[PDB]
Design an enzyme around this catalytic site. Structure first.
Site, PDB file in Angstrom:
ATOM      1  N   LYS C 159       0.827  -1.202   0.000  1.00 41.76           N
ATOM      2  CA  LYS C 159       0.000   0.000   0.000  1.00 41.76           C
ATOM      3  C   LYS C 159       0.863   1.254   0.000  1.00 41.76           C
ATOM      4  O   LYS C 159       0.626   2.185  -0.777  1.00 41.76           O
ATOM      5  CB  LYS C 159      -0.931  -0.001   1.211  1.00 41.76           C
ATOM      6  CG  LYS C 159      -2.059  -1.008   1.135  1.00 41.76           C
ATOM      7  CD  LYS C 159      -3.097  -0.747   2.212  1.00 41.76           C
ATOM      8  CE  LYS C 159      -2.503  -0.840   3.608  1.00 41.76           C
ATOM      9  NZ  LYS C 159      -1.761  -2.106   3.826  1.00 41.76           N
ATOM     10  N   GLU C 185       0.818   6.063  11.141  1.00 43.89           N
ATOM     11  CA  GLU C 185       1.776   5.250  10.407  1.00 43.89           C
ATOM     12  C   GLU C 185       3.178   5.477  10.967  1.00 43.89           C
ATOM     13  O   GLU C 185       3.379   6.233  11.920  1.00 43.89           O
ATOM     14  CB  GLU C 185       1.713   5.559   8.908  1.00 43.89           C
ATOM     15  CG  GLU C 185       0.580   4.847   8.179  1.00 43.89           C
ATOM     16  CD  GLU C 185       0.655   3.336   8.304  1.00 43.89           C
ATOM     17  OE1 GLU C 185       1.777   2.788   8.255  1.00 43.89           O
ATOM     18  OE2 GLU C 185      -0.405   2.693   8.453  1.00 43.89           O
ATOM     19  N   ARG C 186       4.151   4.806  10.359  1.00 45.30           N
ATOM     20  CA  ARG C 186       5.500   4.768  10.908  1.00 45.30           C
ATOM     21  C   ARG C 186       6.195   6.112  10.745  1.00 45.30           C
ATOM     22  O   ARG C 186       6.160   6.718   9.671  1.00 45.30           O
ATOM     23  CB  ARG C 186       6.307   3.670  10.221  1.00 45.30           C
ATOM     24  CG  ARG C 186       5.650   2.304  10.271  1.00 45.30           C
ATOM     25  CD  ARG C 186       6.334   1.334   9.336  1.00 45.30           C
ATOM     26  NE  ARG C 186       5.746   0.003   9.406  1.00 45.30           N
ATOM     27  CZ  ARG C 186       4.593  -0.338   8.850  1.00 45.30           C
ATOM     28  NH1 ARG C 186       3.875   0.530   8.156  1.00 45.30           N
ATOM     29  NH2 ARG C 186       4.147  -1.582   8.993  1.00 45.30           N
TER      30      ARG C 186
HETATM   31  N1  LIG Z   1       6.339  -3.022  -6.369  1.00 46.38           N
HETATM   32  C1  LIG Z   1       7.085  -3.710  -5.474  1.00 46.38           C
HETATM   33  N2  LIG Z   1       8.198  -4.377  -5.843  1.00 46.38           N
HETATM   34  C2  LIG Z   1       8.947  -5.064  -4.962  1.00 46.38           C
HETATM   35  N3  LIG Z   1       8.649  -5.143  -3.655  1.00 46.38           N
HETATM   36  C3  LIG Z   1       7.560  -4.523  -3.145  1.00 46.38           C
HETATM   37  C4  LIG Z   1       6.700  -3.755  -4.050  1.00 46.38           C
HETATM   38  N4  LIG Z   1       5.705  -3.250  -3.306  1.00 46.38           N
HETATM   39  C5  LIG Z   1       5.905  -3.656  -2.030  1.00 46.38           C
HETATM   40  N5  LIG Z   1       7.007  -4.416  -1.939  1.00 46.38           N
HETATM   41  C6  LIG Z   1       7.509  -5.010  -0.681  1.00 46.38           C
HETATM   42  O1  LIG Z   1       6.426  -5.144   0.243  1.00 46.38           O
HETATM   43  C7  LIG Z   1       6.665  -4.356   1.413  1.00 46.38           C
HETATM   44  C8  LIG Z   1       5.383  -3.712   1.938  1.00 46.38           C
HETATM   45  O2  LIG Z   1       5.162  -2.462   1.289  1.00 46.38           O
HETATM   46  P1  LIG Z   1       4.448  -1.236   2.041  1.00 46.38           P
HETATM   47  O3  LIG Z   1       3.419  -0.626   1.126  1.00 46.38           O
HETATM   48  O4  LIG Z   1       5.529  -0.371   2.634  1.00 46.38           O
HETATM   49  O5  LIG Z   1       3.657  -1.923   3.258  1.00 46.38           O
HETATM   50  P2  LIG Z   1       2.053  -1.844   3.341  1.00 46.38           P
HETATM   51  O6  LIG Z   1       1.568  -2.613   2.143  1.00 46.38           O
HETATM   52  O7  LIG Z   1       1.735  -2.484   4.666  1.00 46.38           O
HETATM   53  O8  LIG Z   1       1.765  -0.367   3.284  1.00 46.38           O
HETATM   54  C9  LIG Z   1       7.733  -3.346   1.019  1.00 46.38           C
HETATM   55  O9  LIG Z   1       8.571  -3.001   2.117  1.00 46.38           O
HETATM   56  C10 LIG Z   1       8.505  -4.038  -0.079  1.00 46.38           C
HETATM   57  O10 LIG Z   1       9.634  -4.737   0.448  1.00 46.38           O
HETATM   58 MG   LIG Z   2       2.242   1.052   4.867  1.00 51.62          MG
END
Ligand SMILES: Nc1ncnc2c1ncn2[C@@H]1O[C@H](COP(=O)(O)OP(=O)(O)O)[C@@H](O)[C@H]1O
Ligand SMILES: [Mg+2]
Lengths: 50, 37, 468
Positions: C159, C185-186
């Site tokens: 997300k 959030e963080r």
């Molecule tokens: N397009 C992408 N390509 C590669 N890895 C991804 C991608 N999107 C997310 N990730 C991995 O999934 C993790 C979760 O993404 P993030 O959006 O920060 O957490 P959340 O989905 O809980 O908001 C990321 O830290 C990354 O390592």
């Molecule tokens: Mg997030």
């Protein structure tokens, strides 16, 4: 009259309403503040103090 | 008078911490007093 | 004419006032914590009139060190935040204090964060596509300029990465103002976004409002309102297009639920507050475009435990023009962005708006993926060799399509080392039309994984020993 002044004077009402403080002191405070005045009916003053 | 009342209440206020365990059990206590805790 | 603290329990504080001096609901009151280590000034938002001149309030700061009977002051108004062009390029907290420049914005105009939504007669449906350059989003979940867009998903499905990607693609070349609301959030993510916007030169056009997950529930409840107040000022007063980013809006609901039981409310189903839908409706209905005044809002909606039936996301779904739903299964398959093409939706994905070709191609892709999902269990148990020839063809096509919906994103480089890519909408439609017809069936499925357009597909296929 006493009810109306007490309603318009929340601080004295709050101080007199508390029951933790000694009753004698509260009655004395009421006398020297509100009901010990010269022009006060004796019976009404006694009822209020009680 | 509306003024002697203030003097009287101030005299009252000028006239006047260790709490006490009121209950205890299971690692929880209820203490009376300590108004400024 | 000042109140006094009577009861303290976590973030909820009871305050007693004199007759006729009870603050109105939502009024901001001030209290002092004088303990040296934790010395501060608590801001308390009046939440309830309990009777007998008592009011229950939510503390905006931690109540550690607060003493019963300390003086409580009433400001006579709700929490107000600075508004104007001056908020652009600065970081604020839920209370309007400038984090990166303390004291900044104190002389600006201040708007209360509690506000009624636009009148119904002022509302206008939005049906204009907002091209992003992401294949899956552009094809199956087309976003709406001036509409409400959400990214649904469980924890760690992408997300935030997708939010940053959309900031890169949409906000970078945006004429108007951007508002980012970090809601529960963080703090590390907030700092990273701040630095990234500064380096990208987008910060000067962006107002950042952060209330982090370490804050008490009241701050997480009110930070969204503060950011939305800034965005509303930009929409209604300055009369310019506004980009609004919220991550994560679910934290508003979560903080509400956290304080609900301490406010004396009997819990509803699944442990949520009884007023979940009403509070969410107020907040979301404030986030909208009126006639002639556009707000394009993108919200990250956390789905607890990947459960899309959870009351919070279920109630949130009704407030969106477009929803991109991220799936844990897709994530675990290594497909990024982990968009669930069958669960996501967009209101402008109809032939009238996007055209017959786009709609037909998207529907064919959805049909193929649905059939593949139906056949997955049979393939797992009995193997592909027991499927009809047409079903084998469809399975191969569906695997290629699902791999091709993945894409290397600009914001994903930090995780893969591969630079991102952008695909025009026409190229996406043409490529998926070709795929749905089996024109790339001869290429290996790995050739379709994490690439851009058809040129990238040809190059990767050549690298893998096949010719496109
Ligand atoms: N397009 C992408 N390509 C590669 N890895 C991804 C991608 N999107 C997310 N990730 C991995 O999934 C993790 C979760 O993404 P993030 O959006 O920060 O957490 P959340 O989905 O809980 O908001 C990321 O830290 C990354 O390592
Ligand atoms: Mg997030």
């Amino acid at each position: 009259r006493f009810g109306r002044v007490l309603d318009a004077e929340p601080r004295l009402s709050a101080l007199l309403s508390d029951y933790t403080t000694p009753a004698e002191g509260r009655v004395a405070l009421l006398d020297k503040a509100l009901t010990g005045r010269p022009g006060v009916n004796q019976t009404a003053a006694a009822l209020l103090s009680q | 008078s509306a003024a002697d009342i203030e003097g009287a209440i101030e005299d009252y206020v000028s006239s006047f911490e260790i709490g006490t365990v009121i209950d205890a059990g299971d690692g929880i206590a209820h203490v009376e007093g300590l108004p400024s805790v | 004419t000042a109140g006094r603290v009577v009861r303290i329990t976590g973030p909820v504080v009871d305050v007693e006032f004199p007759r006729g001096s009870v603050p109105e609901l939502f009024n901001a009151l001030h209290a002092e914590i004088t303990f040296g280590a934790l010395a501060k000034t608590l801001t308390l938002e009046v939440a309830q009139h309990l009777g007998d001149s008592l009011v229950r309030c939510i503390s905006m700061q931690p109540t550690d060190g607060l003493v019963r009977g300390v003086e409580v002051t009433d400001t006579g108004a709700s929490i107000s935040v600075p508004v104007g062009d001056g908020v652009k390029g600065h970081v604020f907290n839920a209370l309007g204090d400038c984090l990166d420049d303390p004291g900044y914005g104190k002389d600006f105009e201040h708007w209360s964060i509690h506000r009624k939504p636009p009148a119904f007669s002022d509302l206008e449906p939005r049906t204009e596509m907002l091209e992003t350059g992401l294949k899956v989003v552009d094809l199956l979940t087309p976003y709406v300029r001036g509409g409400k867009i959400a990214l649904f998903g469980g924890a760690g499905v992408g997300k935030t990465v997708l939010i940053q990607e959309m900031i890169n693609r949409i906000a970078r070349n945006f004429g108007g103002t951007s508002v980012f609301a970090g809601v529960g959030e963080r703090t590390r993510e907030g700092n990273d976004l701040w630095v990234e916007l500064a380096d990208a030169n987008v910060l000067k056009d962006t107002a950042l409002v952060f209330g982090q997950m370490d804050e008490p529930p009241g701050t997480r409840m009110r930070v969204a309102l503060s950011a939305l107040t800034m965005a509303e000022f930009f929409r209604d007063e300055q009369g310019q297009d506004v980009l609004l980013f919220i991550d994560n809006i679910f934290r508003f609901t979560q903080a509400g639920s956290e304080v609900s039981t301490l406010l004396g409310r009997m819990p509803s189903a699944v442990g949520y507050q009884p007023t979940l839908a009403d509070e969410m409706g107020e907040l979301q209905e404030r986030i909208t475009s009126t006639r002639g005044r556009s707000i394009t809002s993108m919200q990250a909606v956390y789905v607890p435990a990947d459960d899309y039936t959870d009351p919070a996301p279920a109630t949130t779904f009704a407030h969106l023009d477009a929803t991109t739903e991220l799936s844990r299964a897709v994530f675990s398959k290594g497909i990024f962005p982990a968009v669930d093409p069958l669960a996501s939706s967009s209101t402008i994905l109809d032939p009238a708006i996007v055209g017959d070709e786009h709609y037909r191609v998207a529907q064919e892709v959805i049909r193929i993926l649905q059939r593949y999902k139906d056949l997955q269990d049979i393939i797992a148990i009995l193997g592909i060799d027991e499927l009809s020839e047409e079903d084998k063809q469809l399975v191969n096509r569906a695997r290629r399509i699902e791999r091709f919906l993945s894409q290397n994103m600009m914001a994903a480089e930090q995780f893969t080392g591969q630079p991102g890519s952008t695909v025009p909408l026409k190229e996406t439609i043409e490529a998926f039309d070709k795929l749905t017809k089996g024109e790339f069936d001869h290429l290996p499925e790995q050739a379709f994984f994490l690439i851009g357009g058809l040129d990238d597909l040809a190059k990767k296929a050549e690298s893998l020993g096949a010719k496109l």
